[PDB]
């Protein structure tokens, strides 16, 4: 089968994630070590903001500057308080984050407020400029309908998202093929320089193949590189390594 | 009662502190609610940086905007990594901190390195410039000798500290009368605009009265206001309230 090539590609696109909120410094350092895997480096790691300085030091020491540090803000609830989301994003940037995964206020959109979503992504993009990329989590599992998923994707991109992301991993339904298709379609129609990040429930190479196949069909075989595509996952890495015989 | 006069004074100078590192948002909100006591507002609360936005919302919600939000960095170990301490301080400010309690690299000082402590305080002070006050924790319990306690105090003040603070609360010996006398004397001799914060072990009004008397005797009855004196404590508030009859 084609499963090993898929596994290799997926691994290089991973945001290797630990978000238990009870990590120790040692566990953060181990995560940095694991990101440098026998089958190549992941695109990035993803951790809570306070761990960024320890991670930055660990990544420098093992000489992996191409492994970026992602973090999360307004996470995971996606509340509609702009001052809080902005302060957290500024802090993340001040910590040294390379990327900030911001949770879009999806409940406010559901209730019919499209403005708060736009304003929040916009100010957080401004705060990131010259320091970090902005990924926006729209929580497709809660948005449910194709209409809202499309809408949220369009608003996020209009407001300045560098990536659009499916899920926080913290609700019942996270990444799904149908949600992925809608978001990739919005990217193709609006801005192919905006990246896509399926996250939550991506267990193995088979799952990974689902989303890579969609990106390939919709935007072309060459589109999904580390600057256009990420897998938000944790235990996926162990699975991929096993598929690759490590 | 003379001691009720003390309980009232000490209460108004408190940094009501919770640093378990497992706080919930509700526990942070509860802490703010406690800062608004039946005997008046404390000077500040002190919490880990990630809780600052929620606390700020909670204090505004209860219409107590003048209760300061302090936080901690390089805490509690006081390592000698400037880049880490700087990043954490920048983040604390970006979160919205009114005050940052930085732990001085006291082990480095004990080892004969004076420059790293000076440099750390200076860049962290510059990081606070125009947004926050900087408290410097010198850890008198570990410095032990009067010479070292005096030295750390002088370094902190010369490098730009707004307060010098006795202890983290995390070592064997925290706030002591003897360490307070040394630190207040340096303040009197060098820069009377620099505040003093005894922390850890101040259980009640009698304990409070000890440090307030030292400040009064050394610098004058008028010197010790919320801009020059703080109590770093937790359980002390319940005791003071019990003294004032609440």
Residue numbers in the entry:
A (entry chain A), B (entry chain B): 2 to 247
Can you provide the manuscript's text about this entry?
The 2-deoxy-D-ribose-5-phosphate aldolase (DERA) is an enzyme involved in nucleotide catabolism. The enzyme catalyzes the formation of C-C bonds between an aldehyde as an electrophile and acetaldehyde as a nucleophile in a highly stereoselective manner. The structures display a canonical TIM barrel fold built up of eight β-α repeats in a toroidal arrangement, with an additional N-terminal helix (α0) directly adjacent to the C-terminal helix α8 (vide infra). Furthermore, all DERAs investigated in this study form constitutive dimers.
We note that the relative orientations of protomers as well as the characteristics of the dimer interface for both psychrophilic DERAs closely resemble the situation in the mesophilic (E. coli) enzyme. Comparing the substrate binding pockets of the new structures with DERAEC, no amino acid exchanges or significant conformational differences were found within a radius of 5 Å about the natural substrate (as represented by the covalent intermediate included in PDBID 1JCL12). DERAs from psychrophilic species had a similar thermostability and were around 20 K less stable than DERAEC. In contrast, helices 5 and, particularly, 6 and 7 show markedly reduced strengths of rigid contacts in the psychrophilic enzymes. Hence, our X-ray structures provide independent clues in favor of the hypothesis that adaption to low temperatures in psychrophilic DERAs involves a more flexible environment of the substrate binding pocket. While in DERASH and DERAEC the melting point of the oxidized form was still lower than the wt value, the exchange led to a marked increase of 8.4 K in thermostability in the case of DERACP. Further tests for the DERACP-A95Cox variant revealed a much longer half-life at 50 °C (>80 min vs. 1 min for the wt) and 86 ± 8% of the wt activity. Nevertheless, by installing a disulfide bridge in the interface of DERACP as a psychrophilic representative, the melting temperature could be increased.
